[PDB]
Design a protein around this nucleic acid. Structure first.
Lengths: 247, 93
DNA sequence: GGCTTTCGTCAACCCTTTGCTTATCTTCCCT
DNA sequence: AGCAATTTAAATAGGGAAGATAAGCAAAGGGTTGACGAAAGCC
RNA sequence: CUUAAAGAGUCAACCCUUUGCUUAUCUUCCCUAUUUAAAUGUUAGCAGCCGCAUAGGCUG
């Protein structure tokens, strides 16, 4: 027995489009799983999965180059060079209207759940982008599978993410089978021995290289199983769909 | 006259027990029609205090008092069916 | 003893010019 | 002061012409976006 | 606590000019629109004269 809260038409601008070194565009499912665990921390409603779809999404720039951001002189000790233009590190920006659907388990009324999600989203930040606007979130429940599809079709219109898996690698199949690659998680390289320059000193830290899976965009109504669009934190330091690989 | 209606999806998802569902039955489930004359709707006179009404209320309340010890020994299924019978007899009367 | 400023150091490309998908709809039935 | 009738049938076919051309210029710019290493005054 | 955290792309403009889409065409034959029927619904609310009446009565 499943419960969901849907925030439709989440207009967000200033999204850090740099998903990884080789992916620029839509934020991956690690971003929205991070947003889900962020509310698990601030609001206390513990979130299993998030199904996110893109209503609108434009990467700022041309069709072959992204619009770089005019950097500001914010480091310490480079005064004197501040009159000249700051050097640009690559961070593409994008705008996106999203539709989010969080699997939550809740025991109180739907009004306080909607208010808690609204108070989170008013202080949230989708992929480094300020949430410009969002409709009032609404609670829908998936008692059975037809009710699961009711929740699924309540995200209309949006293009959700379905996992199609890795055959050999990322570049090969992106040309061959023409699917989109995105960060489904990370791979740990080395333990980090210096916790002085970090957010926490006690949380263990690892250098990571983003693993990618290959995904497709399908409209939420054309997705047969809603579990193939709900991304959640898998126990391989990755994220994964509940329904597995989309067929 | 009519049963309360619960619009809440989480409440419809989770509520199972007798009181634990009944605590979710609010005034907004059909009773609260429009709500602009609430203060006149809750200023009340007490002209019921008569002979036969008070003795009837006392004898029935003490009847309940004497029998409610078997009510807690019932199961959920019993409570639901017994209260359905009580509601049916109440609309009948 | 670092420390913060400014000047000197080291380079060298082969490019290409839209789709990705493509939207949540009535038979029985008796009141 | 509303009443205005019903069915029945609506054409078969033959044609939609080719021949010509569809300019040549000249433009299409760069201006900022550099981090380590190394002298070198300075607390 | 989401490759989290952060960032002003600004400016400027002469698309010019030129032009022959002309030419000739048989649309054409054919043929039954036929037959009915109450306009009813009171189908009219008038003309004088008795009067102060545009109140009320009478006359045919």
């Amino acid at each position: 027995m499943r419960k969901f809260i849907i925030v439709k038409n989440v207009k967000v601008d200033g999204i850090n489009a740099k998903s990884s070194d080789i992916t620029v565009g839509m934020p991956p499912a690690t971003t929205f799983c991070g947003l889900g665990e962020t509310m698990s921390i601030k609001t206390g409603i513990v979130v299993k999965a998030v199904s996110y779809g893109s209503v609108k999404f434009e990467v700022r720039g041309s069709r072959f180059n992204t619009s770089v951001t005019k950097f500001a002189w914010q480091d310490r000790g480079n005064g004197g060079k501040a009159n000249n233009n700051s050097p640009i590190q690559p961070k593409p920006l994008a705008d996106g209207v999203f539709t989010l659907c969080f699997e939550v388990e809740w025991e109180d009324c739907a009004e306080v759940l909607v208010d808690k999600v609204t108070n989170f989203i008013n202080t949230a930040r989708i992929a480094g982008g300020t949430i410009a606007s969002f409709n009032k979130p609404f609670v829908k429940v998936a008692k059975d599978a037809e009710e699961l599809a009711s929740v699924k079709n309540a995200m209309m219109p949006c293009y959700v993410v379905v996992d199609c898996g890795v055959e050999v690698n990322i570049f090969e199949d992106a040309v061959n089978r023409k699917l989109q690659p995105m960060v489904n998680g990370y791979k740990k390289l080395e333990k980090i021995v210096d916790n002085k320059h970090m957010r926490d000193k006690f949380t263990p830290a690892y250098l990571a290289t983003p693993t990618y899976t290959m995904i497709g965009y399908k409209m939420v109504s054309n997705v047969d199983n809603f579990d193939q669009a709900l991304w959640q934190y898998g126990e391989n330091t990755k994220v994964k769909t509940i329904g597995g690989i989309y067929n | 006259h009519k049963k309360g209606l619960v619009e809440d999806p989480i409440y419809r998802a989770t509520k199972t027990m007798f009181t634990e569902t009944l605590q979710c039955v609010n005034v907004n489930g059909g009773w609260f029609n429009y709500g602009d004359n609430i203060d006149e709707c809750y200023k009340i006179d007490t002209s019921f205090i008569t002979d036969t009404y008070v003795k009837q209320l006392n004898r029935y309340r003490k009847k309940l008092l004497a029998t409610k010890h078997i009510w807690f020994t019932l199961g959920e299924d019993q409570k639901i069916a017994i209260l359905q019978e009580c509601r049916v007899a109440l609309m009948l009367g």
